[PDB]
């Protein structure tokens, strides 16, 4: 089980690096790959098959599925769910 305390603070940190590297901003001044910042992270939380575990461990672990559960956290302003990062 993994908890990300503020995924909205990770987006603010990545926006700072992108603006200092002069990458052209988009909506709410966030970089063009801000969706991919969160999507490539959260796609790793998942349940894998017995065949995946058997292949990864070279046969050492047989008959078990593996999993990673995620609880990301997002702060909103004035309860607005329609903003770009949320």
């Amino acid at each position: 089980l993994i908890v990300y305390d503020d995924l909205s603070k990770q987006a603010v940190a990545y926006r700072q690096i992108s603006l200092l590297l002069r990458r052209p901003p988009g909506r709410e001044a966030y970089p063009g790959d801000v969706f991919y910042l969160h999507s490539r992270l959260l796609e790793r939380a998942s349940r894998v098959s017995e065949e995946y575990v058997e292949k990864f461990t070279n046969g050492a672990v047989t008959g078990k599925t593996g999993s990673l559960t995620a609880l990301p956290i997002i702060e909103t302003q004035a309860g607005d769910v329609s903003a770009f990062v949320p």
Partner: peptide, 14 residues
């Protein structure tokens, strides 16, 4: 995501 890396000037809203 790739447009600025291809050397293109951005248009409206990036």
């Amino acid at each position: 995501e790739v447009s600025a890396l291809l050397g293109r000037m951005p248009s409206a809203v990036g």
